[PDB]
Symmetry: C5
Subunit: 344 residues, 5 copies
């Protein structure tokens, strides 16, 4: 007979199936297997603190009833329009800004009922998940994107869902994300929302993102360093050349001020301090201190002992400033590597 | 018997329940308990003057009728699709740009009816609430976000709602807001909209936000200060070096003009004066005044008394300018601390 | 009897009410009283030329029929879902980019029917109204926002609507608009759209906005002025200092070019000239002319008469340039004040 | 009798009107008169290549049937909700990114049926039309916006539509567009989409836009010119002043590099060359060539014949560079005026 | 008889057509011909990694049943509203961010049934397709846009679709894309999604985009080159002019730092290195090295042999630096041309 009408027979008014009643009512909890496939991952935004994913949610659960066992066909495909008839678990996302279904040509929803009573339900969804992130160490940060599936109004005694045994989370290859790189650990855990009403089920899949330092290393870090090196040539310039040294020193100060001012527009718009800010502030200190010594030495030589003292101060700061800059660099880089390692 | 049909019996045409009639009609006012849980708080925008929240609205009210008292089950869960049947209070938000419900998989709406007649109604909502804010003192400002729930068309004699006794407003931990920090006071009050028709009920929960000065202190405030210090070295430079002093002074003026020009792009786009604007204007004054004195002293020495007078002017402005800058700094910081303390 | 069913009796098929037929058909025009309350005003955008408002539209009109006169209740509240039953005037907005209703929890629509037959209809709407604006004088401009309500397909003989006698337009206090200030005149007028088909009714409420000059005065106007003052110190610098004067003059030219280049990013993106553009162009002229004279005087003194002539040219331009700048400033400010006064 | 029911009689099941069948089936083509009124024109975006319009589409066509000829009323107004009943021509827009109807209070749709059988159908629509545009000559470009109405699935033998005889396209006064100016020619033409299936009807109204050169002339063009003039003063400066000339020349090069760098942010983000780019490149050449000659002359005089040769080179390039710049300016402006004239 | 009712006869309950059953059930696979017409291509966004297209999807398939063969008309046009009746293949797009239908006036859907049983189905769709792209070589990159059509839930034994024999993909002329140029190869291939359930059909059309180097060549590449040339004039400047050389060298360093800082705002916001970044870093090296040699030579001459050695170093670096810059340029350009050729 026509396959669709057989389904009508199964879920129709004649037979006592009420879509509003959980399978195994007043009984053992319904177990739901969950499989997630990520088509596209991207659009991470630091300001609004959300990223966008397109996924293929796949729930598997067993229904005691709705087992026909008298048909040649081994499975039945329900029409996507009349999806109200089957009881579907109310699975939502705890950290959801907004999500909607797809209607490109037909509903991207597939439901298949096996002979024994297994139900396979697949839904293609696009989601704006909200993940808290921080930029304490902005060039070298490892953010974690948390995706959590939780029930709405059903307790542990009623509905339980957990991850599939193998291949629970899969990702289509070649994401080519603009800033971060998606790692392949994809660790899975459990959450149990303990509320006043009772325990609620939750499962959680998190993803690790590691930010690439290509543009960050080549721009900002390398030019600042070079400008500090060019700041130190004033030491090697003879003391008598007052216009040449004053002009060079102030111009280098202007140069770094322009570099920082230009780079902040590219940088994220946050209010707490970051690592790049510390680096820029330290470079401003180095250029500023190098100008100050020139004005601290020229005063000394106009008022032959003073000449000797001035040249001594020149040579001392000549070998002092690179070595102190090296000590700063070693400590700064070591500290950030240790802190990122601690994070991971 | 099947739980759903029992509900049908209760709210069906057979029994006289009209969803359009308030419980306790022509009687004492219906009291509605209100609980709010904030999943996510963020996306504060100074231009459009709105912020976005995702909440879990939870209304509790007592209905005299709809009390079954003849069933084993202690509570009944109504289907979210057929929510028209129950009478729901028309609670809206007075300051709403836009809001919509969630349909991730199923309706994020739960309604539960107790044995006695208590109704528990939970709705997950995302809201764009509008809060007036001001930036009279932009780096150190404390804005208040006002969330107010008001009735639509029901008077105090008909419908009254107030906050829950304990845990009325709850916030999920780890917001990690980009600029502000959410405080934990969360004070609650009442409003009564007195109109021509009559008094209308309203309850109001406000949140205090304190802006972090990390990036604001490290960038702009610290470099400007350093550039003013480098402006004062021209005093210590000998008078005879006309190219060195003129070049240094104008270059410092250029340097601050570039810093202010770069920083305004990062700053908010408002038309009234702020605190950072006062600081930048004052620094421009300091660099400008320091150039002016050099051109006021060089004229004096070309026309031995004049030489003495010139060197006197040099030494006087040498000890004058830092001390006056210190007096300005003390007054500026003290005034802003007092005004922010007054605000809080 | 139940209040709702009484309404059913009134507007049901049994009685001859056809919602598609105007009250007083083939008769005197229906008069509609209109009241507007502005919850929020903001999001003025110069590029797309639209602003966003949230309002409380309140239409009052009298219906000859639908007068019950046999009930204890003095008014009847119709269910918002079944609003098709009553005849509602088709009032639209002539300058509408986009508008939509609110569904925060329930429909924000209230309709109340009095005993005599008065109908009170209240709708909360958010609107993107389009108002033409211009920036001929950008820092000192007074734009007018025009809100106009017009009928759609009904002539003057059929439907007429006008403003309420008192309190026709009300605004909630504390808008805190980022750039403009909303004035309180709120003048009301009439329009009659004379078309080929006939006269159509329209009423119009306009709002006056005055742009604050805080940030505009403190930034751009004040630094440019100071840079022009620093440009004139080259006159007081001795002629013999060729590196000092050439360096100072070109550096000041660079300084203003940087200020204008930075400020244009903040400024609106329009193609016609404004006032700030005239001010920046004039300042560029002043710096350019001051460099030109230095190169016009140095040539004169290398080829003792020439020395005297050169020093004469120096002193003449020394007292010339400030006074001419003052004459420009007086004319520019006076002209803009007169033109803005003419506008208002 | 009630006017609405008369319409029911006309289009009801009793009478044989099938809304799915074209008027004059198996007969002469239906002729549709088309009238367009533009409420608002704006939001031209060069990146996405689309502009937004709000229009009043007005189709007039004659229906042989649906002529009552037995009623006092001379016209009948159909309810906007039940618009499925009448047969409406399937007119779409060939170059449409997105469009939607308006629901401000009621449907902005009016349909009126005359006594003889003329049908007047008016729809208010907002449209995002896509028009290809180019910026070969960006400051002086004349873009054309093409609006084309075409049938969907109906051939010339079935459905033909053309423009109204007089006042086919009308525009509400005072657009105040930010960059372009809308011209009043508004020329109308025909298109016939010849496909594999057959000829399809189309009518096309295009609009001419002329870009204002106010801000473009005052900023960028005028300062660059002035900086080139200030570059040439180095020629008049004496050869012996090596710091003054080298400093001035390089500073002018820096000045133009800053102006171009600042202005590109304001300019459109396209990849092909424009006119402003040619102007900036040419100015960079002029400043660069003027620095090169100074370094080409100073070498000559250190190695009395060489002194004479150097001063000769100075005077020659002194009168050479302005005149060559003038020749460039004349050719550049003449070429752009000719090309824009060719376009129009 | 009326054409529509004949269709009703064909697909009505009386005849056994169940829209939920595939044509040729339990039989040979249904073959679907696919034709795509691109109205508009644009809005390529590097950040979110998606582009927007407006297309005319045209599916052709043969249905054994639904062949009337007793009517004068050679084809039947089904009403777009009642499209549920016919069985439509569930064709979706594998890489879809979001897509929706058009409702400008009527549904942009046409279905025509031939006499034999061929079904022609045309749908106008706007799509946000997601294509991975990379910017390893940003000025000279060739990205590929992949459009793939795949079935949802139907295996190869059930449903197969492939491209039309001729004119499978067509593009309307005159795209005028802002950055890329669309090529005309438009190569077609197959994909077969091998899953756990079975093989699924897919067809794939890709488009080649070549980025124009107009603005990229004229701006950034040409000025940097010129600034490096102006950096080398310091070699030709005499050694004794310490203020002139130091001032020129540092000013050129400042000039390039400003150019790079300004240009990054225009450039895409990605984290990995690009080609333009390498070019800017190399130019910073050239200016930095040229300053370093001046400070490496001046030290040598203050401590007649040293004078000779200094002048030797000057001449050596004078002929060294251009030639090394030439070697770099040749290698850089050759490498990028080879890599782009490899890509294509
Ligand atoms: C879902 O899985 C849970 C896992 O705990 C099952 O619960 C256990 O079932 C076994 C088998 O009957 C019992 O031995 C345990 O006592 C159960 N534990 C609890 C805590 O109930 C549950 O049976 C599964 N659901 C179904 C429908 O089989
Ligand atoms: C809702 O709470 C209000 C609080 O005022 C209750 O009103 C009071 O009820 C008590 C108990 O009967 C009376 O003694 C007071 O006279 C009431 N005050 C007023 C102003 O009416 C009200 O009864 C509560 N609602 C319900 C349904 O119990
Ligand atoms: C709506 O107001 C108009 C105002 O013009 C009323 O029209 C006038 O009504 C008075 C009172 O009967 C007459 O004396 C005038 O001749 C009317 N003027 C016109 C131009 O018709 C109108 O009656 C009001 N509508 C209703 C329903 O009362
Ligand atoms: C629509 O206009 C067309 C214009 O071509 C009309 O077609 C012509 O009608 C006249 C009058 O009967 C004939 O003399 C011509 O032979 C027709 N030309 C063609 C090409 O058919 C058409 O009749 C008009 N439609 C209606 C319904 O009158
Ligand atoms: C769709 O095309 C496929 C192409 O493979 C057809 O399948 C072949 O049909 C021919 C003709 O009967 C047979 O000789 C082959 O054995 C078939 N191959 C396979 C793999 O089945 C198929 O018949 C076409 N569909 C229809 C409805 O004709
Ligand atoms: C090595 C034995 C005596 C050293 C005296 C000495 C000299 C000196 O010039 C400085 C010293 C210490 O400390 C540091 C921290 C390096 C300073 C950096 C800031 C500036 C302005 C000066 C530096
Ligand atoms: C202390 C006894 C006499 C002081 C004379 C004196 C000298 C002086 O140079 C100034 C004085 C006062 O006032 C202040 C406000 C500090 C001025 C700041 C602005 C400039 C251009 C000059 C400053
Ligand atoms: C007062 C009696 C004779 C005055 C001669 C005189 C001298 C002079 O230097 C100028 C004069 C007029 O006109 C103005 C408009 C002020 C000019 C501004 C532009 C420049 C380059 C030069 C200015
Ligand atoms: C007029 C008789 C001989 C002229 C010799 C001559 C000299 C000269 O300096 C130049 C000449 C031609 O050609 C132009 C194109 C103007 C050049 C512009 C670029 C630079 C660096 C030099 C210019
Ligand atoms: C040709 C025979 C001996 C050459 C000695 C020599 C001299 C010299 O100045 C340089 C040399 C090599 O290597 C290159 C890579 C060109 C250097 C570029 C970086 C700087 C600071 C110096 C350059």
């Amino acid at each position: 007979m026509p396959p669709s009408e057989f389904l009508d027979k199964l879920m129709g008014k004649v037979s006592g199936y009420d879509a509003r009643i959980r399978p195994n009512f007043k009984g053992p909890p319904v177990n739901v297997t969950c499989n997630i496939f990520i088509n596209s991952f991207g659009s991470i935004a630091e300001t609004t603190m959300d990223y966008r994913v397109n996924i293929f949610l796949r729930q598997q659960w067993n229904d005691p009833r709705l087992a026909y066992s008298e048909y040649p066909d081994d499975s039945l495909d329900l029409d996507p329009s009349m999806l109200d008839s089957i009881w579907k678990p109310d699975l939502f996302f705890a950290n959801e800004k907004g999500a909607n279904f797809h209607e490109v040509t037909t509903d991207n929803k597939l439901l298949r009922i096996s002979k024994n009573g297994n139900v396979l339900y697949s839904i293609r969804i696009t989601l704006v998940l909200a993940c808290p992130m921080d930029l304490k160490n902005f060039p070298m940060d490892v953010q974690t994107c948390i995706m959590q599936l939780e029930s709405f109004g059903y307790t542990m005694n009623d509905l339980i869902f957990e991850w599939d045994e193998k291949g629970a989370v899969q990702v289509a290859d070649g994401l080519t994300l603009p800033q971060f790189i998606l790692k392949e650990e994809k660790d899975l855990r459990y959450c149990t929302k303990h509320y006043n009403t009772g325990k609620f089920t939750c499962i959680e899949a998190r993803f690790h993102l590691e930010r690439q330092m290509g543009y960050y290393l080549i721009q900002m870090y390398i030019p600042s360093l070079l400008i500090v090196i060019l700041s130190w040539v004033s030491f090697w310039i003879n003391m008598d050349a007052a216009p040449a040294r004053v002009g060079l020193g102030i111009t280098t100060v202007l140069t770094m001020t322009t570099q920082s001012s230009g780079s902040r527009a590219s940088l994220p718009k946050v209010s707490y301090v970051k690592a790049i800010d510390i680096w820029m502030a330290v470079c401003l200190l180095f250029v500023f201190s190098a100008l100050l010594e020139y004005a601290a030495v020229n005063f000394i030589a106009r008022q032959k002992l003073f000449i000797s003292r001035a040249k001594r101060i020149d040579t001392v700061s000549r070998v002092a400033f690179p070595l102190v800059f090296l000590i700063f660099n070693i400590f700064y880089w070591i500290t950030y590597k240790i802190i990122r390692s601690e994070d991971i």
